Design an enzyme around this catalytic site. Structure first.
Site, PDB file in Angstrom:
ATOM      1  N   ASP B 134      16.278 -18.480  -1.623  1.00  0.00           N
ATOM      2  CA  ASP B 134      15.592 -17.883  -0.261  1.00  0.00           C
ATOM      3  C   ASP B 134      14.307 -18.020  -0.069  1.00  0.00           C
ATOM      4  OD1 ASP B 134      14.911 -15.932   1.894  1.00  0.00           O
ATOM      5  OD2 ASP B 134      16.884 -16.636   2.697  1.00  0.00           O
ATOM      6  N   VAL B 162      17.080 -16.937   5.540  1.00  0.00           N
ATOM      7  CA  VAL B 162      17.452 -18.374   5.173  1.00  0.00           C
ATOM      8  C   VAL B 162      18.852 -18.600   4.686  1.00  0.00           C
ATOM      9  CG1 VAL B 162      16.755 -20.637   4.128  1.00  0.00           C
ATOM     10  CG2 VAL B 162      14.987 -18.973   5.203  1.00  0.00           C
ATOM     11  N   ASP B 163      19.247 -17.794   3.590  1.00  0.00           N
ATOM     12  CA  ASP B 163      20.323 -17.721   2.988  1.00  0.00           C
ATOM     13  C   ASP B 163      21.401 -17.298   4.094  1.00  0.00           C
ATOM     14  OD1 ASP B 163      19.817 -18.492   0.227  1.00  0.00           O
ATOM     15  OD2 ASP B 163      20.016 -16.298  -0.224  1.00  0.00           O
ATOM     16  N   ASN B 164      21.426 -16.437   4.945  1.00  0.00           N
ATOM     17  CA  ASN B 164      22.486 -16.109   5.744  1.00  0.00           C
ATOM     18  C   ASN B 164      22.547 -17.025   7.064  1.00  0.00           C
ATOM     19  OD1 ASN B 164      23.540 -13.844   4.449  1.00  0.00           O
ATOM     20  ND2 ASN B 164      21.540 -12.805   4.945  1.00  0.00           N
TER      21      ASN B 164
END
EC number: 2.8.3.-
Lengths: 360, 356
Positions: B134, B162-164
């Site tokens: 991320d 950015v991950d989620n």
């Protein structure tokens, strides 16, 4: 020419501004016929423009998220529009709405009004705060919802001012979640014969984006940061033992591998302050670009912290085919990609009310 | 009891960390059978504590343990994929191909199989081949821009947006693929790059360089900061009267919206002069009572205790009776079924016997 997932589906899009229309744009890219419902004269976001030297102004909020859509212009307070909307909804697979709670009901276009007439109709609601009580009834925009959900936490600014993230992450994330929820509903209907009511709150999305950090408070990895170099900053993540050792040798500091302050990862966390000091002493011998080149060639995660201006000119950006031309103006495509069809549309946005004779 | 959108579908989840498993968790909530494929010792994220990374995104999944480099695991995976509707993978480009488990390997056997790939940078060429997390992808995609820091350091957002966001986009694309297969008979290869998602979240800011409003900020008060957005003419006017400054409405410096933007520094001094006479909480109460957008800049510790947070039913409990652990549900809600699961995460290899 090739089939798209949502061919034949009709969407009635009552949304404005960014989040709801992005969801609409995702549906368009997947092949749905999406019909915007705008106030007489058009949506207000059409007029919010940005200056382009020597050219007509660019409707920076409206244009990117309404390409390939259709438009009807209607005044929803009059009885004539109510009836046109009821007839139009009888033909629809999905209704998308983003007014504040209670609005559509007062207009006689609530889920019960529409679904009693059309048993196959999926009804989707996007709100700022949920509409689950008094505190969640309010209208909101990205900036205020982000701050109310905690997104300023732990980011120090020079003046002590809360850090306000300068891009609309809550809007754009909310758009994709809504699109996701419509897709789930369409599948539910397809397989199980159930036509659902779907609700997405921007607040809920924002909370979701911060879920890991929020979680520590619901229940009563270094080096991975930005570092000074000789010229500019470099972002490095090398906390896994193989990467950490690799890093120490590459920056000319083998002593750090066996230094009792840094040898184990837990030590790196406790003595995190000392570590950045040692790394930056070593990183001083090269520019960040040089370190990036070296660290990547050896399989370490590192990059420059590019500005927006720099991003659009990188080879990576060019490689991912991230832009489209709208007749001309350049915009960014939706992120998900598919092999059997192109999730893009070339058509321009509709003019306000362009399809009145067609749908009203 | 009631029907769920993904009843009967089986998902093979090779993903690690946050992005991919979140997508799997959405699929679980929507009723899918999602089978985790883990390293023999159990995923590494099981150990990174208590377990802020693993527990929230793997509830209700099943688990198999295998060593993917061995031919035995390779064959077991091939047999399992024959029964699957979706494969979720999040290794760097080329990895699954090297194991003999790439899209052509699996789709040659199972023509109805949807193959979904989540990568850091896309894998469309040499530049997009790298692994990433991320924090690094976010910085490389431009997310530090325009955020000044005390020390001059680039500002790193301290949550994994950015991950989620990528998880939800992957879930969305898997859902689209399922509909594609359902209606058109096409079983697709789906690709989502975290970089592309990050670019998308900043699309308007990027767009200005591809081609070429006040008051809306945080303000000092007597105690704390208040966030106010009141730049629309009707709202601007209300604000001025409520903070006791009717003179600002007609002040040549601030009367028009464009003027407020140009003279934002002077505006801020005038506003903070007026806001100094009350606490932030007091101003929020007053401004909201009059239909203006205003709030405190809550910390994470504060958010969880607000009445708003309680209203939205955002938490669920994992275990039974005492010593349960609290996590946050996925955001989308549905009337005809509950997109939630009570079931705990699987233990490492718990379903080895049932699937291999």
């Amino acid at each position: 020419n090739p089939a798209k997932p949502l061919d034949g589906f009709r969407v009635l899009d009552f949304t404005q501004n960014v989040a709801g229309p992005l969801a609409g744009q995702v549906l368009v890219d997947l092949g749905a016929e999406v019909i915007k419902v705008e106030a007489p004269g058009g949506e207000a976001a059409r007029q919010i423009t940005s200056v382009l030297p020597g050219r007509p102004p660019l409707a920076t909020y409206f244009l990117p998220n309404n390409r390939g859509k259709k438009s009807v212009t209607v005044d929803l307070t009059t009885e004539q529009a109510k009836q046109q909307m009821l007839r139009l909804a009888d033909t629809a697979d999905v209704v998308l709405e983003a007014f504040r709670p209670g609005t559509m009901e007062k207009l006689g276009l609530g889920p019960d009004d529409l679904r009693s007439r059309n048993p196959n109709l999926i009804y989707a609601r996007l709100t700022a705060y949920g509409g689950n009580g008094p505190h969640g009834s309010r209208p909101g925009i990205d900036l205020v919802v982000a701050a109310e959900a905690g997104m300023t936490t732990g980011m120090p600014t020079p003046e002590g001012k809360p850090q306000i993230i300068p891009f609309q992450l809550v809007d754009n994330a909310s758009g994709h979640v809504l699109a996701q929820a419509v897709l789930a509903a369409l599948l539910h209907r397809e397989r199980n014969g159930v036509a659902d009511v779907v609700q997405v709150a921007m607040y809920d999305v924002a909370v979701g984006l911060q879920a890991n950090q929020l979680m520590m408070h619901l229940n009563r990895t270094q080096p991975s940061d930005a570092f000074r170099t000789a010229d500019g900053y470099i972002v490095i993540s090398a906390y896994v033992p193989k990467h950490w050792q690799k890093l120490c040798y590459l920056i000319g500091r083998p002593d750090l591998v066996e230094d009792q302050r840094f040898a184990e990862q837990r030590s790196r966390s406790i003595n995190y302050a000392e570590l950045t000091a040692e790394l930056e002493l070593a990183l001083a011998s090269k520019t960040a670009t040089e370190w990036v080149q070296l660290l990547q060639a050896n399989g370490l995660m590192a990059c420059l912290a590019h500005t927006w201006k720099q991003v659009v000119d990188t080879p990576l950006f060019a490689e991912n085919d991230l832009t489209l031309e709208v007749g001309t103006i350049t915009v960014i495509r939706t992120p998900a990609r598919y092999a059997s069809f192109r999730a893009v549309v070339t058509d321009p946005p509709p003019t306000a009310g362009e399809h009145n004779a067609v749908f009203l």
